[PDB]
Paper text:
[name] splicing is executed by a dynamic ribonucleoprotein complex known as the spliceosome. RNP remodeling of the B complex by the RNA-dependent ATPase/helicase Brr2 results in the dissociation of U1 and U4 snRNPs and the recruitment of about 20 protein components, forming the activated spliceosome (Bact complex). Conversion of the Bact complex into the catalytically activated B* complex by the ATPase/helicase Prp2 allows the branching reaction to occur, generating a 5′-exon and an intron lariat-3′-exon intermediate. In this manuscript, we report the cryo-EM structures of the human Bact complex in three distinct compositional and conformational states at resolutions of 4.9, 5.1, and 6.5 Å.
A follow-up 3D classification with a soft mask in the RNF113A region led to the identification of two major conformational states at average resolutions of 5.1 Å and 6.5 Å on the basis of the FSC value 0.143. As will be detailed later, the 5.1-Å and 6.5-Å reconstructions represent the mature and late human Bact complexes, respectively. Compared to the mature Bact complex, the late Bact complex no longer contains the splicing factors RNF113A (Cwc24 in yeast) and NY-CO-10 (Cwc27 in yeast). Because RNF113A directly protects the 5′-end guanine base of the 5′SS, its release may signal the beginning phase of the Bact-to-B* transition. Intriguingly, the N-terminus of RNF113A is buried in the cleft between the endonuclease-like domain and the N-domain of Prp8; therefore the release of RNF113A requires conformational changes in Prp8, which is confirmed in the late Bact complex. With the dissociation of RNF113A and NY-CO-10 in the late Bact complex, the RNaseH-like domain and Bud13 have been dislocated, and the endonuclease-like domain of Prp8 also undergoes a 45° rotation.
Residue numbers in the entry:
A (entry chain A): 835 to 946
B (entry chain R): 402 to 442
C (entry chain 6): 7 to 95
D (entry chain X): 171 to 194, 209 to 250, 258 to 266, 280 to 286, 293 to 316, 323 to 360, 382 to 395
E (entry chain Y): 8 to 112
F (entry chain A): 1391 to 1502
G (entry chain 5): 12 to 119
H (entry chain Z): 480 to 537, 563 to 617
């Protein structure tokens, strides 16, 4: 579990790595992720609690990155649900690879 | 009693050189520079 | 946890560190330094030579009493070297 | 001029060396460098339990061929008298250390090694001399005048 | 016991080699192993400490009359870096339940 | 092969026998020896998460296809700098365009 | 090659109120012989149990494989049980008879 | 008293030459050979013969297993017990020094920004 | 992939950055601690008979008799104290019969606790003996089984048959592991109960702490004592949670002390403070709650005193200092809180305990309690202990107690010094060694706290000691040297002339021992012996200094801490006698030595030396080697520290204007270094200017003031705060030498250039800045 949570948290930290003064919400995100390093078991239990219960989340921001040809959707979530979802993802992919869920023909693959 | 293990596996001098995880290199920001691995002189 | 030792006042001069330097001991104030501090060598000895009366660092100066504590005559009680209610070191 | 000095020296092993380095007592027959369990060697063979190679033991009491149990070798094993020895044997002729069975790598292959038990041990009713690893092949037989039992080996197939 | 904490102040502060306090000597092979177990003998301690070198000759102090070890040995290797390695490495070791001590001489 | 020979010799492999291939191979063999390697062994699907980072994060990643932690660093440009300075006429060549001789520094070897 | 804090006693939780000691002995009986096992019969302690083995390494292999192991719908809480704490409910005594015995039989 | 005082005194030669480091002395000896190279080889470059054979190949000693790496790379003696007895300070000291090398690089990576 | 899988914690990296294990293999035995007038001679035979009846404890008896030296003073107090030592019941019987026979003869002219230690040692002799005849895994009994687990659990057989499976399990752990077995899973579609600590909030539980706090997890509520233990989980709020929860919880439990009583609290605490996973902070906080509740509870704690100390005594021996002063404080509050007889009668059985750990930390405990209740109250106990004829370990303990009393009380020992000595003296001649060693050591500690006074109280101790000085090999010798060492300053320069001159020989001979304990002792000795006013210079100059700088100055010493300091001091004093140019002249060449710590050492040494004696003694050439040494050493700085800087400043200010020819080299180095690579050395070169200001002034080098003035003026745009601060400081010091109207950067320039800097946040800038604005504004 610690392995997974660590990976996901690093991933989240990687978007802000250049780190200008950012903003308020982003500040909340860095402080909360930073919190997750100090007391991991807390974060893991809170996460599993969400996954067992909450069916209603908060509103996601949306904005368009401009490639000058086709626009790219961009979504913004509150940090709590981002850490929760992130761990959910590292875990899902891990179990998935262990159990050989995806046959080889699907190739945005880690190997190559 | 020797202390034995199957096979040999690997030494040590290297077995712990480069950082860990760390992840690539920012989302891919312009500001980063970082093209060169070692200093000039 | 922190209170005076109040052993008998000797002829040894008080020693305050950088931090405590300006403070009159009891009134906690910087005003009107007038008279001089005396504490027993039981409180001031050895590693306490030139030690701070408070924090436990080396004394860079000597404490002076205020005029306030002067008229109220508090400077004449037991040696005002604070002891923590563990040991003094 | 009988004994010049009464003490002199040794240049010899110490009991606490060999003691501390092998303890269940102190034991003999420390595993060689090769030894590895058979199941993981069936994992490098890419073999699930269906096609995997597992050595099962078979017992026949030497007087009556007519299982007290059946024993897997997959989980080396110390064949001894019973507590120290893992593979305990009720045979009263077995020395406190009788023999050992180590799977080694030459391939994952079974091996039997006598510890120099005082009586000896018979292989296919033909004994082997002490202090060398002797490969065993399937269906071979072991018995520990002093033989109260028999043993056979089987690979798992069919 | 004090040794290991000197090696930690030497590594922690970034001493960087030749200023090492094994350069205190440069003249001496013979090492001091104290706090040794009484059952031990020449061939043994030779077999354990030939690990880090080739030991030329060791005189272990054994009481003259009774003819048993007083509990320590002065050893001599063929190589100094073996001594540096041995003091800096083999120290704080358990033997027969008791932790031996080593240091130069 | 280097693993097999090491097995038969029972002696483990050193750095030097691997100094040949050290930087070579698509996995970039040196990446086995990363200190944090454990953690990364439990990371899966990283390559696709990088593909979908464009939606989570506003900025545009050109390096989306690979990641140095799983795949290593796939290029070394250190030469390009040296050859660049050579083509311009050496330190004395480039500096000849500057104020350097104004600063009256004895040498450029100490420019900081 | 073991951490010192682990002990032959394991506290086990997330148990049903119907659970049978048959399943208990069977399952836990993999790793080694049971020294014995207790189960809370009291309003707060119902759902909890303590397992004690003839050897520690038994328990070590246990918590190794039994970590988060499943029964019914539940993933059992498997922890190494502490020491001291509440003890002195019992006393130190009754040493005299047994020590007199070992002093008698073997004579030592 | 000549032969006796030469037993004790020539033992001062023996245990004196032995004391320091018999291993150390030979390495010093090799340097002496090097001086000999200088007399004939004042400024050697390349194909001159010592270099030739030089690049033309690229007393019991302990047998069993392997001896863990020693900063100074010394094979253990003949009859050595064949068991690692250590505080592990070599490895950790060995590992830590290696770690620093990684540190100098990831220190640099910082500089360009 | 399988090859990369063959190539197949960071949280354990960052989490271990929080707190630590900190501890050795010796201390971890903590984890093994489970929770809790000639008819006065013949009359001593009588009392020995009666008390022996009510066997063999020497201590209580000598405690009883210990009231005799006051004779006719003794009174009802003897009933009080002994009341705790034996059963308070028989207490009234024995003390009553004693006063009767005493008053008559004059005219005509816990047991269970100790019973446990005896059985403990006897089982130790049984097991130890058996192996000769021939640990925690030893088989157990059902009463022993009922001993561990708490209340409310049942033992079960399910079958007799499954029990027979458990019995064959041992045989089948070998047998059935060698048999057919495996596990598999099938693909099929699929309730999940669990508990955190819910109520409203209940800050989080670590996965282990569940064992302690499990009772809180169950939600059964609202139906006596069980509700007090249940509500007492406010502990959990103290341990983990937000700081406000810890505060409010802490008060709430303070005011409920008198309510809940000490029993339930300690019952629910001592397990936590005993926890193997305990933090640093959590420990300290539980220490706080123990204090705050022990400011209130007084008579209540009597049953729990030992049950407290067992956990607390490990605080006295610790690497953390604040932990130690806390521990001494709370044991002070406990002993003073409880009664004397409570403490005494409590802590006896730990004296003869097999482990020396508990003996030691127990000794420091008696030190603390003796500081609490005073020396004279506790004297007869001790004086009874050191004469105990049972076994030596006791006397060893009691003597160690004398020592730790010496360290703790220190200067305040003075009144009872005589009685204390009269106690300890009988151990110096004892057949056992330890007792002798630790004894003489305790004399040392005494004399060191005895700084000069009470010499004749040590008097009778001497003549044996000196004799021992001859015949001893090993550590005990060095110990004697420690004692005698601290003694000599207390003797008369005539008697101490002879005696000293005798000590000097052995002192010389013993420089060379590899023992570092040795070198510490003989070092401090050389300080006291050779720092004596009654010693002749030339004798030291010849006999001592060459071996002193030979063996003592080496790279073994300096890397260590205590050896570093003490070495500094001793060398300083030798300079104080033989003079300056000698010492310095010999140690200058080492300024240029490779390693830092060594350079740091000789550097601070030169600093203190030239601080005391003055630079006047120094000749010319050695002064060249000085300034060059100091610059050279200063040019390579691996760490930031004052020693090099204060060193330089003191050297220069001591040299006065003899330094003038050296300035251009100095300040050249000062500017070139004043660039280098920024953040490291800028601040340091700046500070160097700051402290060298006055010297760069009085000698009247004005060009240099132009230099520093405008050059430093230019750096005020430096973005690194830690540098800029040092810059402003340097400017400050330059203002205090050259005056207002002569400032080469006229204030019109300077001050408004300072004004915008006040936004600068980070500290040192604000400090120096505001200071300078103050000097000029004033
Ligand atoms: Zn006082
Ligand atoms: Zn202060
Ligand atoms: Zn005042």
């Amino acid at each position: 579990d610690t392995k997974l949570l660590i990976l996901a948290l690093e991933r989240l930290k990687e978007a802000y790595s250049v780190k200008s003064r950012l903003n308020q919400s982003q500040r909340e995100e860095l402080g909360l992720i930073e919190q997750a390093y100090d007391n991991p078991h807390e974060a893991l239990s809170r996460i599993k609690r969400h996954l067992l219960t909450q069916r209603a989340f908060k509103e996601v921001g949306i904005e368009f990155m401009d490639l000058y040809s086709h626009l790219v959707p961009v979504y913004d979530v509150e940090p709590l649900e981002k850490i929760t979802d992130a761990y959910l993802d590292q875990y899902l992919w891990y179990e998935a690879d262990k159990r050989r869920l995806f046959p080889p023909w699907i190739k945005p693959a880690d190997t190559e | 009693n020797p202390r034995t293990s199957n096979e040999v596996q690997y030494d040590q001098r290297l077995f712990n050189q480069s950082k860990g995880m760390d992840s690539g290199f920012a989302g891919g920001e312009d500001e980063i520079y970082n093209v060169y691995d070692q200093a000039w002189r | 946890d922190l209170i005076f030792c109040r052993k008998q006042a000797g002829v040894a001069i008080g020693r305050l560190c950088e931090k405590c330097d300006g403070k009159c001991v009891i009134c906690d104030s910087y005003v009107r330094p007038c008279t001089l501090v005396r504490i027993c060598d039981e409180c001031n000895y050895g590693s306490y030579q030139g030690r701070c009366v408070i924090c436990g660092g080396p004394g860079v100066s000597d404490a002076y009493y205020c005029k306030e504590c002067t008229i109220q005559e508090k400077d004449r009680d037991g040696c005002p070297k604070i002891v923590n209610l563990g040991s003094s070191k | 001029n009988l004994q010049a000095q009464e003490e002199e020296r040794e240049f010899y092993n110490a009991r606490r060396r060999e003691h501390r380095q092998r303890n269940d007592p102190g034991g003999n027959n420390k595993e060689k460098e090769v030894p590895a369990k058979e199941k993981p060697s069936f994992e490098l063979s890419g073999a699930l339990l269906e096609d995997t190679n597992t050595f099962r033991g078979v017992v026949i009491k030497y007087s009556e061929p007519p299982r007290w149990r059946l024993y897997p070798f997959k989980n080396a094993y110390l064949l001894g008298r019973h507590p120290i020895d893992h593979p305990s044997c009720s045979k009263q002729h077995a020395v406190f250390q009788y023999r050992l069975v180590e799977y080694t790598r030459a391939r994952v292959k079974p091996y039997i090694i006598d510890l120099g038990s005082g009586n000896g041990t018979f292989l296919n009713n033909k004994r082997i001399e002490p202090q060398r690893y002797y490969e065993l092949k399937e269906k071979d037989v072991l018995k520990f005048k002093d033989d109260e039992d028999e043993e056979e080996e089987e690979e798992v197939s069919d | 016991k004090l040794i290991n904490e000197l090696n930690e102040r030497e590594v922690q502060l970034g001493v960087a080699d030749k200023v090492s306090w094994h350069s205190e000597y440069k003249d001496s092979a013979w090492i001091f192993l104290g706090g040794l177990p009484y059952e031990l003998t020449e061939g043994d301690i030779i077999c354990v400490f030939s690990q880090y070198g080739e030991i030329v000759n060791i005189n272990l102090v054994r009481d003259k009359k009774t003819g048993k070890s007083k509990g320590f040995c002065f050893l001599c290797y063929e190589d100094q870096r073996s001594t540096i390695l041995a003091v800096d490495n083999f120290n704080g070791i358990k033997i027969k339940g008791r932790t031996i001590r080593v240091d130069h001489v | 092969l280097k693993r097999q020979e090491a097995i038969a010799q029972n002696r483990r492999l050193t750095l030097e026998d691997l100094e040949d291939s050290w930087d070579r191979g698509i996995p970039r063999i040196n990446t086995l020896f990363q200190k944090d390697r454990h953690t990364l062994a439990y990371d899966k699907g990283w390559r696709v998460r990088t593909d979908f980072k464009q939606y989570q994060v506003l900025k545009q990643n050109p390096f989306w296809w690979t990641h140095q932690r799983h795949d290593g660093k796939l290029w070394n440009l250190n030469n390009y700098r040296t050859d660049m300075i050579q083509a311009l006429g050496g330190v004395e060549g480039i500096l000849e365009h500057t104020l350097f001789k104004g600063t009256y520094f004895p040498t450029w070897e100490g420019l900081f | 090659r073991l951490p010192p804090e682990v002990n032959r006693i394991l506290y086990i939780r997330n148990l049903p109120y119907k659970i049978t000691a048959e399943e208990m002995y069977d399952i836990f009986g993999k790793y080694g012989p049971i020294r014995q096992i207790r189960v809370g019969n009291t309003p707060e302690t119902r759902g909890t149990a303590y397992v004690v083995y003839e050897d520690i390494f038994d328990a070590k292999n246990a918590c190794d494989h039994l970590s988060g192991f499943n029964v019914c719908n539940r993933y059992l809480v498997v922890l190494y049980y502490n020491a001291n704490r509440a003890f002195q409910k019992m006393d130190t005594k009754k040493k005299e008879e047994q020590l007199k015995l070992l002093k008698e039989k073997y004579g030592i | 008293q000549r032969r006796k005082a030469e037993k004790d005194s020539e033992r001062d030669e023996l245990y004196a030459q032995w004391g320091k480091g018999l291993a150390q002395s030979r390495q010093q000896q090799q340097n002496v050979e090097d001086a000999m190279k200088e007399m004939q080889k004042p400024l050697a470059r390349y194909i001159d013969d010592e270099d030739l054979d030089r690049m033309l190949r690229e007393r019991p000693r302990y047998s069993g297993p392997a001896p863990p790496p020693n900063r100074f790379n010394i094979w253990p003696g003949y009859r050595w017990d064949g068991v690692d007895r250590s505080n592990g300070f070599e490895q950790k000291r060995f590992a830590r020094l290696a770690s620093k090398k990684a540190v100098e690089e990831l220190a640099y990576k910082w500089s360009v920004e | 992939p399988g090859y990369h899988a063959p190539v197949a914690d960071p949280f354990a990296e960052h989490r271990p950055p929080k707190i630590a294990d900190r501890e050795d293999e010796y201390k971890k035995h903590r984890r093994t601690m489970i929770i809790s007038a000639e008819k006065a001679k013949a009359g001593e035979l009588k009392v020995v008979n009666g008390a022996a009846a009510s066997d063999q404890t020497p201590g209580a008896t000598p405690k009883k008799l210990s009231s005799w030296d006051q004779a006719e003073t003794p009174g009802h107090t003897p009933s009080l104290r002994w009341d705790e030592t034996p059963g308070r019941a028989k207490g009234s019987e024995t003390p009553g019969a004693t006063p009767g026979s005493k008053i008559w003869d004059p005219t005509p002219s816990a047991e269970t606790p100790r019973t446990d230690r005896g059985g403990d040692s006897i089982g130790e002799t049984p097991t130890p003996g058996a192996s000769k005849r021939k640990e925690r895994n030893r088989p157990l009994s059902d009463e022993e089984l009922d001993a561990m687990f708490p209340e409310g659990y049942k033992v079960l057989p399910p079958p007799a048959g499954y029990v027979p499976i458990r019995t064959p399990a041992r045989k089948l752990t070998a047998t059935p592991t060698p048999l057919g077995g495996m596990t598999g899973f099938h693909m099929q579609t699929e309730m999940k109960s669990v508990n955190d600590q819910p109520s409203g909030n209940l800050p989080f539980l670590k996965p282990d702490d569940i064992q302690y706090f499990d009772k809180l997890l169950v939600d059964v509520d609202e139906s006596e004592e069980q509700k007090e233990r249940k509500i007492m989980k406010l502990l959990l709020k103290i341990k983990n949670g937000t700081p406000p929860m810890r505060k409010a919880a802490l008060r709430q439990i303070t005011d409920k002390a008198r309510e809940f009583g000490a029993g339930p609290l300690f019952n629910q605490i001592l397990p936590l403070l005993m926890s193997p996973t305990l933090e640093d902070q959590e420990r300290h906080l539980l220490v706080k709650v123990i204090d705050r509740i022990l400011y209130k509870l007084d008579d209540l704690v009597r049953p729990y005193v030992h049950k407290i100390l067992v956990v607390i005594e490990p605080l006295l021996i610790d690497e953390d200092y604040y932990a130690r002063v806390e521990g001494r404080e709370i044991i002070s509050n406990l002993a003073k809180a409880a009664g004397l007889a409570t403490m005494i009668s409590t802590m006896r059985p730990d004296i003869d305990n097999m482990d020396e750990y508990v003996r030691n930390t127990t000794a420091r405990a008696f030190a603390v309690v003796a500081s609490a209740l005073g020396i004279p109250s506790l004297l007869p106990f001790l004086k009874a202990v050191c004469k105990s004829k049972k076994s030596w370990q006791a006397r060893h303990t009691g003597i160690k107690i004398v020592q730790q009393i010496a360290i703790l009380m220190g200067c305040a020992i003075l009144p009872h010094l005589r009685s204390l000595v009269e106690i300890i003296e009988h151990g110096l001649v004892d057949e056992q060694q330890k007792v002798r060693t630790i004894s003489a050591l305790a004399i040392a500690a005494l004399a060191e706290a005895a700084t000069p006074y009470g010499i004749e109280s040590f008097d009778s101790v001497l003549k044996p000691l000196w004799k021992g000085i001859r015949q001893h090999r090993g550590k005990g010798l060095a110990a004697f040297l420690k004692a005698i060492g601290y003694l000599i300053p207390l003797m008369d320069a005539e008697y101490a002339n002879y005696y000293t001159r005798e000590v000097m020989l052995i002192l010389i001979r013993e420089f060379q021992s590899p023992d570092e304990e040795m070198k510490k002792i003989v070092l401090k000795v050389v300080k006291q012996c050779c720092g004596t006013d009654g010693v002749e210079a030339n004798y030291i100059k010849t006999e001592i200094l060459p071996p002193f700088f030979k063996h003592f100055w080496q790279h073994r010493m300096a890397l260590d801490r205590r050896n570093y300091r003490q070495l500094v001091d001793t060398t300083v004093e030798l300079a104080n006698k033989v003079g300056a140019a000698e010492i310095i002249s010999r140690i200058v060449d080492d300024l240029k030595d490779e390693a830092e710590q060594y350079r740091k050492m000789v550097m601070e040494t030169i600093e203190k030396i030239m601080g005391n004696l003055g630079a006047a003694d120094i000749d010319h050439k050695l002064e060249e080697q000085l300034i060059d040494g100091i610059l050279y050493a200063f040019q390579e700085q691996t760490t930031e520290d004052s020693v090099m800087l204060n060193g330089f400043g003191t050297v220069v200010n001591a040299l006065g204007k003899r330094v003038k020819p050296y300035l251009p080299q100095i300040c050249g180095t000062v500017l070139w270094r004043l660039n280098n690579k920024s953040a490291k050395v800028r601040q340091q070169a700046a500070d160097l200017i700051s402290r060298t200001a006055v010297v760069m002034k009085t000698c009247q080098e004005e060009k240099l003031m132009g230099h520093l003035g405008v050059v430093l003026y230019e750096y005020l745009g430096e973005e690194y705060p830690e540098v800029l601060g040092s810059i402003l400081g340097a400017l400050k010091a330059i203002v205090n030498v050259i005056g207002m109207h002569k400032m080469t950067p006229p204030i019109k320039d300077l001050l408004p250039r300072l004004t915008p800097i006040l936004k600068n946040r980070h500290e040192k800038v604000q400090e120096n800045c505001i200071d300078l604005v103050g000097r000029i504004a004033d």
